Design a protein around this ligand. Structure first.
Ligand code: CWS
Length: 283
């Protein structure tokens, strides 16, 4: 027992669950997706982030409602979550991993260039544009995101009264974005092999110890099917030291991403999505 706000009902007809619901914009009769966040500062920042961003591999906000709960209107993603393509040891073919990963890299590079760190990249936050395996992907869930300081201002003065831990923190400052590159490394491992790199399944070593040591579970039988280049990129993103860890630029320059065929398929999917909204141009 509950109702939708009158302002939402005015513009949309709510439907099935995908908290995410299928809805229809009355004006166009087009399918939309409505994210319902229960009841503030994280939602306002998320909306502000979503509105400012403009990239084909990042979800766009269509509308927003601040009522009994928060209602976020987004583009519908027919393919659903990437999670559903990797769940229960299901694995994607290398070429599919590459097409998807390239887009995730472009999306995360864009975020980083724009002073945004996602902080929660997972297969459940990566959505697919269609039920076809060759599709566009979009990064979602900016609820844990951070905007890129008090350290810089502190450094301007004389450190007469400054604590040693603050001066020691100068070595590693400005490397928070590297958390996204680690997550991408974990996502890539899962896509390639169908299993997680770090887990509490059939092991004595604790999840914390596996992650800090950077000793992922390597199953040769599973990995033999995967190329040496794809595994080399995983290895370079799964680096413990955030200062040594591969950035989005380094990952995009890696030999595994140097595939003209995959890049062509991406641009082809791009023009296909844009064709419906393309306005005549000055020749
Ligand atoms: C965040 C968001 C946006 C669009 C979606 N479209 C389909 N299925 C989902 N689970 C979706 C989630």
């Amino acid at each position: 027992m509950s109702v939708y706000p009158k302002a939402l009902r005015d513009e949309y007809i709510m439907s099935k669950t995908l908290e995410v619901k299928l809805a229809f914009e009355r004006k166009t009769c087009k399918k939309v997706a409505i994210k319902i966040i229960s009841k503030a500062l994280n939602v306002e920042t998320e909306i502000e982030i979503l509105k400012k961003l403009n990239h084909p591999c990042i979800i766009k906000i269509k509308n927003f409602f601040d009522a009994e709960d928060y209602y976020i209107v987004l583009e519908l993603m027919e393919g659903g979550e990437l999670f559903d393509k990797v769940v229960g040891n299901k694995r994607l073919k290398e070429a599919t991993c590459k097409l998807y990963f390239y887009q995730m890299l472009l999306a995360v590079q864009y975020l980083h260039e724009n002073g945004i760190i996602h902080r929660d990249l997972k297969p459940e936050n990566v959505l697919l544009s269609s039920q076809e395996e060759d599709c566009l992907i979009k990064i979602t869930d900016f609820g844990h995101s951070k905007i890129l300081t008090s350290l810089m201002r502190t450094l301007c003065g004389t450190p007469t009264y400054l604590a040693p831990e603050v001066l020691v923190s100068v070595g590693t400052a400005g490397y928070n974005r590297a958390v996204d590159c680690w997550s991408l490394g974990v996502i890539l491992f899962i896509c390639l092999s169908g299993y997680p790199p770090f887990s509490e399944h059939r092991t004595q070593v604790s999840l914390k110890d596996q992650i800090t040591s950077g000793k992922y579970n390597f199953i040769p039988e599973v990995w033999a099917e995967v190329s040496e280049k794809a595994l080399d990129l995983v290895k370079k993103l799964l680096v413990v030291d955030p200062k040594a860890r591969f950035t989005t630029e380094e990952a995009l320059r890696h030999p595994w991403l140097q595939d003209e065929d995959m890049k062509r398929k991406f641009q082809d999917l791009l023009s296909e999505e844009n064709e419906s909204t393309a306005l005549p141009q000055v020749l």
